[PDB]
């Protein structure tokens, strides 16, 4: 049971929203769903599955928001937390560069069409982007 254009995986129905939403706005919205919340990514197969789910979004969109943020919130004197707001703990990795390379980037990660949506890039948790949302029953 999953909406059209929606695809199930692990244990939640995923749906793409061509509607932009701050990482904090899609997080709170996809949260209003049955334990839903910005798409998750704890497996090398899910990171590639979500990419194919948003790889046909449209040239009018190259990046996509996901449920990944920086638990350091500007504290970890190094930058090595990265936690999914809809998956659990960092059990999977696929970021382009570590936040310790740039002067503390934003506190939210998004997909970058440049890497075929197979890499996460930091972005201002406020910039809104087309996003995905997972949610079981």
From Swiss-Prot:
Motif EPN, residue range(s) on this chain: 76-78
Impact upon substituting residue 76 to Q: Reduces peptidoglycan binding and antibacterial activity. No effect on binding to phospholipids and membrane toxicity. No effect on filament formation
Disulfide bond residue pairs: 2-13, 30-133, 108-125
Effect of residue 55 to A: Reduces binding to phospholipids and membrane toxicity. Loss of filament formation
UniProt activity-regulation remark: Lipopolysaccharide inhibits pore-forming activity, explaining why is bactericidal for Gram-positive but not Gram-negative bacteria.
Residues engaged in binding Zn(2+): 12, 69, 83, 107
Residue ranges occupied by any C-type lectin domain in the UniProt entry: 9-134
Region of interest: Sufficient to activate EXTL3: 65-80
Assembly mode: Forms a hexameric membrane-permeabilizing oligomeric pore on membrane phospholipids. The hexamer is formed by three dimers related by helical symmetry. Forms filaments, filamentation traps pore complexes and limits damage to host cells. Interacts with EXTL3.
Function comment: Bactericidal C-type lectin which acts exclusively against Gram-positive bacteria and mediates bacterial killing by binding to surface-exposed carbohydrate moieties of peptidoglycan. Binds membrane phospholipids and kills bacteria by forming a hexameric membrane-permeabilizing oligomeric pore.
Protein name (record): Regenerating islet-derived protein 3-alpha 15 kDa form
Full-protein residues shown: 39 to 175 of 175
